[PDB]
């Protein structure tokens, strides 16, 4: 309910998670990652919640991992540290409920890596995005080497990771790093409209779409197609499917409960 | 050569398959899938045919699939239903001859899934594309969860499948969902020009290209590269290679029989 | 360092490899492939070199490959010839040091395949890229069928391979085949700028980024992620990491000496 | 349903396909492969058939592909010939009904590839198995390079393919190439006993087991697991599940109608 | 630390988890899974623990998933139920510390799937193992369709899942389903011997071995090899490596402390 | 021709590589690895050589990497060291000519990893095999964690790697770690017999089998099968295939030139 480093708001079917360390530009530290994990678990457990939005308080969405940790890591501890925080990102990606990253400002390092773990990214024009970990003599340790490459392609991902350069929102849109950009002033509203569209749909169909997409993409195409087919069987069994098929024939809007 | 729900036309080495249920916006039903399957096998079997083109009659390319069994399908029958329909799409994808989807209008749900099975998509500016299965409380069941994701990336494919929203032709082109958009008035001409270029080329080279590209993409890069090299040996044995090489060396336009 | 078909130039920590057969539009032949292999081996061996840039002399980056032998190859010999040339491309892709293809002109057939093996591509607006092998009754045999498809997607790669038509640099940028295009007049300057930015960074971190990205991309995502995490432990053992973390805490600019 | 090179017999819910070219040791020619394809399709569509068993007439199971075809083919035709035959094997492997190869004798080259395509292999002690294609200056072309390697491991597979040496049934059992070996005199009864036990189970459960095993094995373990879980949801909607669960609850034998 | 359905015992470096529902042959119910989960998380958290052993009290290791659950589930609920239970098995498989299944008797369905999630299996000759889920009109839903097939091969895994027939310990050993079998009377001794050998090794090296083997097996061979190499970097940073290499050069016995 | 740490002998078609550091049980130092690489590359390039055999001088096959190298390595140097040595193993594995490891005695750590890189392993009953790296506070770094677990299975491989314990020849054979075990006194003759058999066969066919098997095993099955088919194309172009098929048809022994 109440957290040191984040704020949570339940708004009907919408769960809003705001990173709340604005003095440190929402830098991810051990506590914030622990709290973000809990919040996301809360949301997944609570059947009122249908869509989760992550955003940042103030100027930054997230400026990265908290560097103060780093000077006292053994290599073996560094491995475990990277794996631990990255596993929080992996949980978010595998969530059975849709997730949106609303990028209001800087999304750098750990910050962009969190955004990459969400299903959909919507950014402000004023947002700046990057993986500046190479500037510290290291490299992205929260999934960025895998997720950025897959999203914008190897050449652009390598140039961003090797130089550490930030790109503007409009460039992120161009490369497909974010689904679209809008002025900061329109961001909350554009995000709310998307989330509310999704929050109307069948929770079970949404969970199956995510499972089938995520698991299928990692597999050979025939194995992903087989997963899609078997899952279609499961969705077909549901009350929301019945509601949906009957709303269509009766020319009304379905209520997917 | 004579069908209830489709029309076929052989023009030289071009084979045109037109979905023909314009009153239902060319919606896919049991009968249409069965005929499409037969038409494609004939085209693949006919040695005069070098390129296949699939398009729709009327306002739509294909606006969806019939919902008329969905009341008498058990979950297990729904699994087999999904698989049976999708496997026809897989057969088009795996044809030894180039296929082009000429998207003249709505390409929605099953219809977009069919277009995604073709090698190349050319669309009309006026075309609308999407996967609205979520609106019925189900999800795409003819390969959309796998092929859309792979073509436009996960962020945009998830947004499209979770909202059900249609996108105009020009957005499809921006996202790489179609190769080109042109005004509907120039669609048949643009398509024909492409088809005619490909039909000039060695059928055996085209067949090997499709095999190594499709099979190689699903493998580790070194395995796909090994497939490319061994196929290169095969294409080097061909009559069209001898013609092609000696045509260039003797400064002459080659004829590929 | 004295080669027949290529020129090599060491400029600080930058190594420039220029294909040098302008009369034949820098066409790849057995000799050029052999020298390029040797030059790239040299660059990788030399600890003063941080970044390798490949480019072409004259109007072409690389306009194709030598077709002279093609009418005298057996199918089994053709398989081996394909494998031999392509393995030099694979070697460039797997290099421990960042590679940039500076595409100044025609990049066709083998020439596009060479560019595809580099980490990053920067092209002139004037450049034209294509795989016209289909026009000889064959198909790309130095990795194009795999690499182009992965880069610009199946639909556009198949159209390019099936028709054999070239695309302008602006289209290549739109498809993601190159990172960006600039006017040819500004191409060297823009490439040097990128190379110099990369050459300032930790060589061990750059080597780890390439290994993790290349190997991770070929695996299921969890396996790529596991590779990224273990690699992070290796990057934390370096002096460059100590320097970079120091520098950030002391609000000063790091110097990555290696 | 009446064939030249094969005999088909339906015994209750068992479908027996017996290769019938005893003079040529059941060697696979274009006609046999054509008829085998038609026979398996026939069995799969017939809802009375639950289990398919493939065996050979006379002393051999199958002594390979027919070598009289080989010296006619160009290299491009040889690629298409390999693909054509092997795709029939693939279809057998992908069948929604359980398949058993009853290896009564010689299973060499194409014949071993045919056996590898089935779900389960039972052989006679007297059976000899191998891939002697290298003795013709070629190598296995109907899947042996892939299926044998996966079944008996690379070391033993490479030794067999590089030497062309045959192994006895007992060695095949030891290496896991067959499930069981029994004297030829007991082979039909051992096979019948296995087929009858399988024929009693839920056909839908058996179809889902095969799909999730075959597709799952080809995927990353998490994708295979996800496929197993969605399939479990489909199997829970079946009438045979209701029967089976109540039978354990009621301490009575179940009947899978 | 005190559980309704399991017993946990911490003998030095070793953590023994014993399934404790002998009247129902250690059948997995929702409570047992929750408790097993907690116990495995505990052992994982605790640096004093180096090796985890799982076994069953009584006649059976584990006779299956509690079938009384299965009556009420909609297809969607059944999907979720499979995934939830199987995700616990996944967690055991992915644990950073070595796990041994000590299979003292019946390992059926859920029971065998639990065994398959452990790193190493040692069984009594007297043990019976199988996946009898097909007898209930269903199929293995806690990972058996994927893990059994990968361990004993597709032919025999299909035969086992399609027939539901159980196999004796010695057949399990022949197929590679267990590492070895010994008489039940020597089973605890054989298991302790193995566990104590592993427990004296570098914890960081063992954690890396498991990560590299598990992640590498699921990848193309070159990617797994890449992961092996980069991990070698990490293991060469440890105090235990210095000790081990020192000990060999000095022709003496190393003591690994896992700093 | 002449090396410091290995001996080589060319007998007809066979090339024998004998590790020659018997005072250190053939432990792999930088020098031995460099010379082994050079010898296998020479053998690959020499058209007279058809089969390569690797064996050890004295008591041992090979007792692993030379441990005197290890306390000089930094972590980043250790990464590099692993990759360098293992890439020599990779090269042996991918060689275009058949390789046999004749395991005369101890094959531990790097020695077992070297044996695992060869196509076929024949061991003496007296041979002891293992991966005792864990005994040194490290783990296998020349590919053992991947190759051993693919060959004998995860449970047996994890137990050997975690305990460091050695197994005798006969258990190696049980596990499929070696093809065959014979007494040391018969080992050279058993190895020679196998080698001479393989050296009779088509060099091009043997190269294609190795490429198709190694690359195919690493792929989804359908991609492996596609590779086998196109390769069959290439092997049908060879003089040796013409000789083999016409030899069989002409009822005579083939001579594979
Ligand atoms: C984002 C940026 C471009 C614009 O910020 P700016 O206007 O320079 O203001 P700062 O971000 O320096 O100031 C905000 C505070 O948060 C801190 N902060 C920012 N990112 C941080 C991180 N990843 N970890 C810990 N602290 C961080 C700053 O050091 C500063 O703290 P201080 O003023 O109390 O010392 C700038 O912060 C930048 O250079 N980023 C470096 C931060 C970073 O960690 N980059 C690597 C991410 S892996
Ligand atoms: C199978 C085996 C070793 C038995 O040998 P055997 O006991 O001497 O019996 P035969 O060789 O007389 O075989 C019986 C008949 O079947 C034929 N036959 C066997 N395998 C055949 C094949 N793969 N293709 C065509 N015909 C075949 C023989 O030519 C012979 O016919 P004939 O009596 O009209 O001349 C032997 O037949 C053999 O070597 N077959 C070839 C197997 C092979 O190469 N398979 C690879 C498939 S590409
Ligand atoms: C293991 C087995 C062969 C032992 O047979 P047995 O020695 O006659 O023992 P019982 O059948 O009396 O079983 C002992 C008790 O444990 C219970 N039990 C055993 N396995 C169970 C399971 N998977 N779910 C629920 N309860 C189970 C039995 O119902 C019985 O309960 P009761 O004594 O309160 O009536 C038998 O319990 C069995 O067949 N279980 C497997 C169930 C199955 O088909 N699949 C597993 C699904 S994951
Ligand atoms: C194989 C072994 C059991 C045989 O024992 P043995 O018959 O007593 O023979 P020794 O131990 O005396 O070995 C003979 C010589 O080879 C040396 N040697 C053996 N394996 C070696 C290795 N991997 N690296 C360096 N030297 C090695 C020994 O140190 C000894 O040298 P010395 O006589 O000059 O001191 C034992 O030598 C051994 O355990 N070796 C280490 C194996 C290993 O851990 N390999 C993996 C390393 S990464």
Domains of chain C (ranges, CATH numbers): 1-201 (3.90.226.10), 202-258 (1.10.12.10)
**Residue B62 bridge partners (DSSP):** B107
Q: Residue C82 burial by CB count (10 A; 0-12/13-18/19+): exposed, middle or buried?
A: buried
Q: What is the rounded distance in angstroms from the CA atom of residue E115 to the CA atom of residue B113? A: 42
Q: What is the rounded distance in angstroms from the CA atom of residue B69 to the CA atom of residue B138? A: 14
**DSSP-H helix ranges across chain F:** 30-45, 75-93, 110-117, 144-151, 154-163, 169-174, 184-199, 203-217, 221-235, 239-249
Residues of B in contact with E220 (CB under 8 A): 220, 222-223
Q: Whose CA is nearest to atom 15 of ligand 3?
A: E24
Give the sign of the dihedral formed by CA B15, CA B21, CA B26, CA B31.
negative
Q: Residue C196 burial by CB count (10 A; 0-12/13-18/19+): exposed, middle or buried?
A: middle
C-alpha separations of B238 from B204, B256, D141 in Å: 8, 11, 20
Longest dimension (CA), chain A: 65
Q: Checking DSSP bridges between strand B14-19 and strand A180-182, what pairing results, if any? A: unpaired
| From E2, E34, E77, E133, active-site residue | E133
Query: Tokens representing C93?
Result: 């892709």
Q: Among all chains, which residue has been given the structure tokens 């191998």? A: D130
Q: Residue D63 burial by CB count (10 A; 0-12/13-18/19+): exposed, middle or buried?
A: buried
Closest CA to E170 of E238, E105, E110, E123: E123
- One DSSP character per residue, E184-204 reads GGGHHHHHHHHHHHHHTS-HH
Q: Among all chains, which residue has been given the structure tokens 């298991």? A: E191
Q: Alpha-carbon Rg of chain A, whole angstroms?
A: 19
Q: In what order do the strands lie in the sheet with F167-168?
A: F60-62, F106-108, F128-130, F167-168
Q: Residue F1 burial by CB count (10 A; 0-12/13-18/19+): exposed, middle or buried?
A: exposed
Nearest atom (ligand 3) to Cα of E67: 24
Residue D151 near residue D115, CB atoms below 8 Å = no
> How many degrees, rounded to 5, is the angle at CA E201 between CA E200 and CA E202?
130
The backbone region for B64, taken as left when phi is positive above 0, alpha when psi lies in -120 to 50, beta otherwise, is left
Q: Among all chains, which residue has been given the structure tokens 């010898």? A: F39
Technique behind the model: X-ray
Residue C135 near residue C99, CB atoms below 8 Å = no
> Chains with 3 or more CB pairs closer than 8 angstroms to A?
B, C, D, E, F
Closest CA to D207 of A228, E142, A226: A226
Q: Three-state DSSP class for B97?
A: coil
Residues of E in contact with A237 (CB under 8 A): 74-76
Contact E222 B222 (CB under 8 A): yes
Count CB atoms within 10 A of the CB of residue D252. 9
- One DSSP character per residue, A133-160 reads GGGGTS---SSHHHHHHHHH-HHHHHHH
Residues with CB under 6 A from ligand 2: D 24-25, 27, 63-67, 106, 108-110, 132-133, 135-136
Phi, psi torsion values for C55, nearest 5 degrees? -155, 170
Residue F131 near residue F108, CB atoms below 8 Å = yes
Q: Among all chains, which residue has been given the structure tokens 């080669």? A: C3
Q: Is B133 a catalytic residue?
A: yes
Cβ-based neighbours of A154, under 8 Å, separated by 6 or more? C119, C151, C213, C217
- One DSSP character per residue, C103-129 reads E-SEEETHHHHHHHHSSEEEEETT-EE
| Catalytic residue ranges of C | 113, 133
Longest dimension (CA), chain B: 67
Q: What is the rounded distance in angstroms from the CA atom of residue A123 to the CA atom of residue A183? A: 8
Closest CA to D140 of D86, D188, D103, D221: D86
- One DSSP character per residue, C126-166 reads T-EEE-GGGGGT----SSHHHHHHHHH-HHHHHHHHHH---
Query: Tokens representing A34?
Result: 């622990």
Continuous segment of H or E residues that includes residue A166 = none
Q: Three-state DSSP class for A10?
A: strand
The backbone region for F20, taken as left when phi is positive above 0, alpha when psi lies in -120 to 50, beta otherwise, is beta
Count CB atoms within 10 A of the CB of residue A253. 8
Phi, psi torsion values for E172, nearest 5 degrees? -60, -40
Q: Residue F255 burial by CB count (10 A; 0-12/13-18/19+): exposed, middle or buried?
A: exposed
> Chains with 3 or more CB pairs closer than 8 angstroms to B?
A, C, D, E, F
Q: How many Å from the N-terminal Cα to the C-terminal Cα in chain D?
A: 27
Cβ-based neighbours of E61, under 8 Å, separated by 6 or more? E19, E26, E55, E101, E102, E103, E104, E105, E106, E107, E111, E115, E127
Residue E21 near residue E60, CB atoms below 8 Å = no
Q: Three-state DSSP class for F188?
A: helix
**Residue C14 bridge partners (DSSP):** C11, C51
DSSP single-letter state for residue C28: B
Residue E50 near residue E97, CB atoms below 8 Å = yes
Would you tell me the crossing angle of helices E110-117 and E144-152 to the nearest 10 degrees? 60
**DSSP-H helix ranges across chain D:** 30-45, 75-93, 110-117, 144-152, 154-163, 169-174, 187-199, 203-217, 221-235, 239-250
Contact E215 C226 (CB under 8 A): yes
Q: What is the rounded distance in angstroms from the CA atom of residue E258 to the CA atom of residue B101? A: 62
Query: Tokens representing B256?
Result: 């590929």
The backbone region for B147, taken as left when phi is positive above 0, alpha when psi lies in -120 to 50, beta otherwise, is alpha
Q: Three-state DSSP class for D51?
A: strand
Continuous segment of H or E residues that includes residue A87 = helix A75-93
Residues in chain D after which the backbone breaks (C–N beyond 2.5 Å): none
Q: What is the rounded distance in angstroms from the CA atom of residue E138 to the CA atom of residue D245? A: 9
Residue F221 at interface with chain B, using a CB cutoff of 8 Å: no
Residues in chain B after which the backbone breaks (C–N beyond 2.5 Å): none
Residue A238 near residue D238, CB atoms below 8 Å = no
Q: Among all chains, which residue has been given the structure tokens 């497909």? A: A176
Phi, psi torsion values for C16, nearest 5 degrees? -105, 125
Cβ-based neighbours of C255, under 8 Å, separated by 6 or more? C243
Q: What is the rounded distance in angstroms from the CA atom of residue A200 to the CA atom of residue F29? A: 66
Phi, psi torsion values for A230, nearest 5 degrees? -70, -40
Q: Tally the residues of chain E.
A: 259
Continuous segment of H or E residues that includes residue D99 = strand D99-103
**Residue B55 bridge partners (DSSP):** B18, B102
Q: What is the rounded distance in angstroms from the CA atom of residue C157 to the CA atom of residue D199? A: 48
Q: Three-state DSSP class for A123?
A: strand
Q: What is the rounded distance in angstroms from the CA atom of residue F226 to the CA atom of residue F228? A: 6
**DSSP-H helix ranges across chain E:** 30-45, 75-94, 110-117, 144-152, 154-163, 169-175, 187-199, 203-217, 221-235, 239-249
The backbone region for C54, taken as left when phi is positive above 0, alpha when psi lies in -120 to 50, beta otherwise, is beta
Q: What is the rounded distance in angstroms from the CA atom of residue B133 to the CA atom of residue A212? A: 15
Continuous segment of H or E residues that includes residue F180 = strand F180-182
Query: What residue in B sits closest to D74 (Cα-Cα)?
Result: B237
Listed by number, the residues of chain B in 18-37 with a beta carbon closer than 8 Å to a beta carbon of chain D are none
Q: Residue A257 burial by CB count (10 A; 0-12/13-18/19+): exposed, middle or buried?
A: exposed
Residue C37 near residue C85, CB atoms below 8 Å = no
Q: What is the rounded distance in angstroms from the CA atom of residue C83 to the CA atom of residue C76? A: 11
Q: What is the rounded distance in angstroms from the CA atom of residue E232 to the CA atom of residue A62? A: 33
DSSP single-letter state for residue D67: G
Residue D74 at interface with chain B, using a CB cutoff of 8 Å: yes
Would you tell me the crossing angle of helices C203-217 and C239-249 to the nearest 10 degrees? 110
Cβ-based neighbours of B171, under 8 Å, separated by 6 or more? none
Q: Residue A189 burial by CB count (10 A; 0-12/13-18/19+): exposed, middle or buried?
A: exposed
Q: Residue E45 burial by CB count (10 A; 0-12/13-18/19+): exposed, middle or buried?
A: exposed
Best mutation target, A76, A80, A211, A237, to test chain E (most E CBs within 10 A): A76
Q: What's the number of CA atoms in the CB half-sphere (13 Å) around residue C25?
A: 17
| Torsion, Cα of D97, D98, D103, D107 (10° steps) | 60
Entry resolution in angstroms?
A: 1.8
Q: What is the rounded distance in angstroms from the CA atom of residue A240 to the CA atom of residue A256? A: 5
Residues of D in contact with E94 (CB under 8 A): none
Cβ-based neighbours of E35, under 8 Å, separated by 6 or more? E3, E4, E5, E6
Continuous segment of H or E residues that includes residue D131 = none
């Amino acid at each position: 309910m109440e957290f040191e480093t984040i704020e949570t708001k339940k708004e009907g079917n919408l769960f809003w998670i705001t990173l709340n360390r604005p003095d440190k530009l929402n830098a991810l530290n051990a506590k914030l990652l622990e709290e973000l994990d809990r919040a996301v678990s809360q949301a997944e457990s609570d059947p009122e919640i249908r869509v989760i939005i992550i955003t940042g308080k103030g100027k930054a969405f997230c400026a990265g991992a908290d560097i103060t940790q780093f000077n006292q890591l053994t290599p073996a501890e560094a491995w475990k540290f990277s794996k631990k925080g990255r596993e929080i990102m992996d949980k978010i990606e595998a969530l059975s409920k849709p997730t949106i990253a609303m990028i209001n400002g800087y999304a750098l390092g750990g910050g962009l890596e969190l955004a990459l773990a969400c299903d959909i990214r919507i950014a402000a024009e004023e947002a700046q995005l990057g993986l500046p970990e190479i500037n510290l003599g290291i490299y992205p340790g929260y999934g960025g080497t895998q997720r950025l490459t897959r999203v914008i392609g190897k050449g652009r991902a390598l140039e961003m990771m090797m130089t550490g350069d930030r790109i503007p929102g409009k460039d992120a849109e161009k490369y497909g790093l974010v689904n679209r950009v809008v002025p900061l002033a329109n961001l909350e509203q554009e995000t709310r409209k998307l989330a509310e569209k999704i929050a109307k749909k069948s929770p079970i169909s949404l969970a199956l779409i995510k499972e089938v997409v995520n698991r299928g993409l990692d597999s050979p195409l025939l194995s992903g197609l087989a997963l899609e087919s078997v899952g279609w069987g499961v969705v077909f069994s549901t009350e929301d499917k019945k509601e949906g098929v009957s709303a269509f024939l009766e020319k009304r809007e379905p209520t997917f409960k």
